[PDB]
Amino acid sequence: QSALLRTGKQLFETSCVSCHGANLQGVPDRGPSLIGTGEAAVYFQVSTGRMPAMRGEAQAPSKPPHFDESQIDALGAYVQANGGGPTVPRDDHGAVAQESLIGGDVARGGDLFRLNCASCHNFTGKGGALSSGKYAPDLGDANPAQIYTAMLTGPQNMPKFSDRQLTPDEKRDIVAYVRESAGPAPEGMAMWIIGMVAAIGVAMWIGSRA
Amino acid sequence: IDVTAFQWNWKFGYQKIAFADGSFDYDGADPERKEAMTSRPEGKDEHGIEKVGPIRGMTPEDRTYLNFDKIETLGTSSEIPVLVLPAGKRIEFVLNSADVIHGF
Numbered sequence: 001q002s003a004l005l006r007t008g009k010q011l012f013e014t015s016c017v018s019c020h021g022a023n024l025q026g027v028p029d030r031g032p033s034l035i036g037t038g039e040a041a042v043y044f045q046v047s048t049g050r051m052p053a054m055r056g057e058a059q060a061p062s063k064p065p066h067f068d069e070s071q072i073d074a075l076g077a078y079v080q081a082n083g084g085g086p087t088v089p090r091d092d093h094g095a096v097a098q099e100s101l102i103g104g105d106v107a108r109g110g111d112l113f114r115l116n117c118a119s120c121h122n123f124t125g126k127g128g129a130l131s132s133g134k135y136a137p138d139l140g141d142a143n144p145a146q147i148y149t150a151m152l153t154g155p156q157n158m159p160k161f162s163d164r165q166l167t168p169d170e171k172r173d174i175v176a177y178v179r180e181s182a183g184p185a186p187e188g189m190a191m192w193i194i195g196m197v198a199a200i201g202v203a204m205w206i207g208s209r210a
Numbered sequence: 211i212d213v214t215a216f217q218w219n220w221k222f223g224y225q226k227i228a229f230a231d232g233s234f235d236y237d238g239a240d241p242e243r244k245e246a247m248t249s250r251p252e253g254k255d256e257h258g259i260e261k262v263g264p265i266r267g268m269t270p271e272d273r274t275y276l277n278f279d280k281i282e283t284l285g286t287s288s289e290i291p292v293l294v295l296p297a298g299k300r301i302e303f304v305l306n307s308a309d310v311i312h313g314f
């Protein structure tokens with residue numbers, strides 16, 4: 001859409017031309033080229049948990065998003081028009097699909113998960129620890145579009161799964177597994193042991209058995 | 211046949227085919243094997259640690275031993291995998307497991 005590309009350039013020019021200079025071209029040793037990353041990869045950062053961290057680091061916190069849902073779409077259309085790549089799954093209305101991305105299979109939605117991706121994470125969906133300063137995040141926060149976009153646009157040190165590698169269907173099923181899956185007492189006992197055994201043993205010491 | 215056996219199903223890779231009679235100029239996929247060398251310049255400490263990795267410089271979650279192939283006959287929980295083999299030929303199985311020890 002003409003407005004979506006236009007808004008995207010204005011928001012891009014004010015956040016990442018420091019690491020992706022001009023029309024999605026990466027700054028060397030600061031950030032990668034954004035040509036070919038596409039809307040869903042942009043979905044996987046600002047829309048998803050891992051918004052990029054200005055301090056360079058091995059991993060980023062899924063820090064609170066700095067751009068709203070219309071803005072994430074405008075930023076994404078700028079990088080899909082500039083680059084050309086994966087697009088975020090969207091519902092009939094045009095919102096990013098979340099419920100539709102809930103896969104029917106959770107049994108196979110799970111089996112897929114263990115061979116593909118369970119290992120860097122947890123079978124539960126709890127985090128795993130990875131390469132240099134790299135960890136695999138807990139996938140509890142991720143909404144279903146987030147889940148589909150980590151797999152389609154492989155983030156950082158996360159294996160990228162193409163729609164051919166994991167079909168659009170299985171990615172939904174994967175979402176179904178990694179979403180379906182998602183004083184007085186000590187004080188009194190401390191008395192009855194420490195304090196009362198101390199007092200009673202002291203009495204036994206002072207007193208006399210008979 | 212690259213027989214990966216992950217948690218509760220199978221995957222068959224067809225690493226290589228070379229018929230003695232002469233056919234099947236086919237091979238597996240050398241890419242897709244990504245290590246997990248946690249060779250960060252510095253860890254939580256300020257300097258000196260420069261931790262390479264727990265074991266042989268790699269983290270336990272490495273999966274470099276796992277070999278991958280172009281033709282993967284992954285078995286889903288609702289679709290039993292069917293490794294198809296040519297009759298009359300010598301079939302080698304390169305066995306590996308993704309998560310846990312189990313049997314084939």
Ligand SMILES: CC(C)=CCC/C(C)=C/CC/C(C)=C/CC/C(C)=C/CC/C(C)=C\CC/C(C)=C/CC/C(C)=C/CC/C(C)=C/CC/C(C)=C/CC1=C(C)C(=O)c2ccccc2C1=O
Nearest residue numbers: 184185186187188189190191192193194196197198200201
């Ligand atoms: C209790 C009694 C002698 C009754 C006489 C029969 C009678 C007239 C019954 C009519 C009343 C009725 C209906 C009673 C039934 C239930 C009942 C007793 C209700 C009232 C409760 C009440 C107001 C008083 C009962 C108090 C009492 C005698 C408690 C037991 C005390 C004794 C002999 C303790 C052993 C000595 C000793 C070395 C203790 C320290 C060692 C440890 C760890 C003992 C176990 C232990 C205890 C004893 C804790 O109290 C406790 C509290 C909170 C957290 C953990 C613990 C714990 O681990």
Ligand code: HEC
Nearest residue numbers: 015016019030031032037041042045052053054075155156
């Ligand atoms: C230092 C400041 C910094 C800011 C601000 C920043 N980025 Fe990044 N970006 C990075 C770094 C470093 C990476 C590499 C980590 C990774 O690959 O996920 C990255 C990764 C990405 C990726 C994934 C590339 C890939 O395929 O692996 C996309 C898409 C992206 N950024 C777009 C954006 C958009 C859109 C904005 C802001 C509107 C933005 N970035 C803000 C530094 C930044």
Ligand code: HEC
Nearest residue numbers: 049050062117120136137138139142150155156157158174
């Ligand atoms: C090492 C193998 C590895 C595989 C395979 C893998 N991941 Fe990840 N994943 C990572 C690492 C490392 C990150 C950190 C990169 C990032 O978050 O930008 C990550 C990022 C994520 C995030 C970031 C959002 C959040 O919750 O913070 C989600 C969600 C996620 N993965 C879920 C999945 C799902 C679902 C699959 C497959 C169905 C999968 N991953 C495949 C290791 C992997």
